[PDB]
Design a binder for these strands. Structure first.
Length: 59
DNA sequence: CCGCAGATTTTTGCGAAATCTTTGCAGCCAGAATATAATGTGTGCATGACGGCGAATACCC
């Protein structure tokens, strides 16, 4: 905080204090939205032919 | 003071090996790959000169 501080440790703790801890199912929900995003990007790559041609070349 | 002997000088020759690059090997080493249970906490704070001094906010009049 603004306490005439000059230690990066202190305000790093300040930064980490803003975000609240997660639960077991919270991690699963966040990973689920991550999986939705990666499936979206996989579909986007899917609609692109040339990347698939390159993948088939390596196969 | 001159020509040959001892000493010194001239010339041709072979073995040896080391070095530079390439190839095979072994110790060194780097990244890539796998899914054990663990999230607001630690932490060092070590501490008794003395004089000068401006800068930085506070507070009375």
């Amino acid at each position: 905080e603004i306490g005439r501080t000059t230690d990066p440790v202190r305000m790093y703790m300040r930064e980490m204090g803003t975000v609240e801890l997660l639960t077991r199912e919270g991690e699963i929900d966040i990973a689920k939205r991550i999986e939705d995003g990666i499936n979206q990007v996989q579909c986007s790559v899917a609609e692109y032919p040339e990347a698939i041609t390159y993948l088939l070349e390596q196969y």
